[model samples]
Target: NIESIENLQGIRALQQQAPQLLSSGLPNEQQFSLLKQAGVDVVINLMPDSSKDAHPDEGKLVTQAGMDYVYIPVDWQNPKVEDVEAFFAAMDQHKGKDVLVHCLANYRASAFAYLYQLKQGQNPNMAQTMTPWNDELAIYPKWQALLTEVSAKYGH
Candidate 1:
């Protein structure tokens, strides 16, 4: 019989959101099993299959590890509102299950999570705290635009 996973790389827990929901950076096969042990039943990926860092067989391995998976293929340089809408829809469809959402580096996950939090009624300070944006990269024009536009439209 098998045993345990000692480490899970890049697992960022979205604590303030739903305890059942988490958002993180890309995880490899070893991390997927760790996800199951952590109680995640669903995995949502925002990376396009064509992305330089995305794994071609990662989805298969996720399912092999016994979790449901969803891929939204967000455009790294230009994510659209419709793309986030579909993400929210999939999340809604699996409400109450433990869901793990990830992007190449948690950049997109944090942005999407921030928007969802705002629309779900968190104030700006509260929502901003939930976003995983870093100091240097936070100033990136497109990244800032994504947060700014979504916040202006939904943060109130």
Candidate 2:
């Protein structure tokens, strides 16, 4: 299952012992070490420095820890078409591997996940198994609309 965190405390715990940690932004040395020790194999950053809450050193931290990291920023409210395309591209590049796509909270992460499932020919309406990261997280309607649009355009 995919887990999300808004603060560093939960991430700290995951870093310490959790199997996988999906960081929304840049974390400190302590947090990074915890994740490395916890056996987290991958860290995906869905937020970049161009945005307000960007993590400038996430790449360096992931590299130093010897863990795989992919930076695919997704704007929360105004995600561009290119961004969605890039997300799918990344997913294709890392298919069947353990990945954690994060952005601030799990909002953007979930949103992208939703579209990814759709693009992969999964049923978008089926909340069970088909939905990305589960529908328990509070996803806005706008995100759904974007996913639908993308799905239609891409013939998913």
Best by lDDT: 1
> Against the correct fold, how does model 1 do in TM-score?
0.81
Instruction: Enumerate residue pairs that collide in model 2.
Output: 15-34, 15-35
Best by TM-score: 1
How close to the true structure is residue 142 of candidate 2, measured as C-alpha lDDT? Answer: 61
Candidate 1 lDDT by residue in tens digits, 18-70: 56667788887778988887678998998888977778877898999899999
How many clashing pairs per prediction, in order?
0, 2
Candidate 2 per-residue lDDT over residues 1-156, each given as its tens digit: 123232345542122111222423345556665555645567777776586665567788787987787877666667777888887777677655555566555556656665666666765443432233356434566666776688789786
Candidates' lDDT values, in order?
Answer: 0.73, 0.59
Q: TM-score for all predictions?
A: 0.81, 0.64
How large an RMSD does model 2 have?
6.1
What RMSD, rounded to one decimal, does every model reach?
A: 3.8, 6.1
For model 1, give the 10-residue run with minimal summed lDDT.
Answer: 1-10
Candidate 1 stretches with Cα past 4 Å from truth are 1-17, 124-131
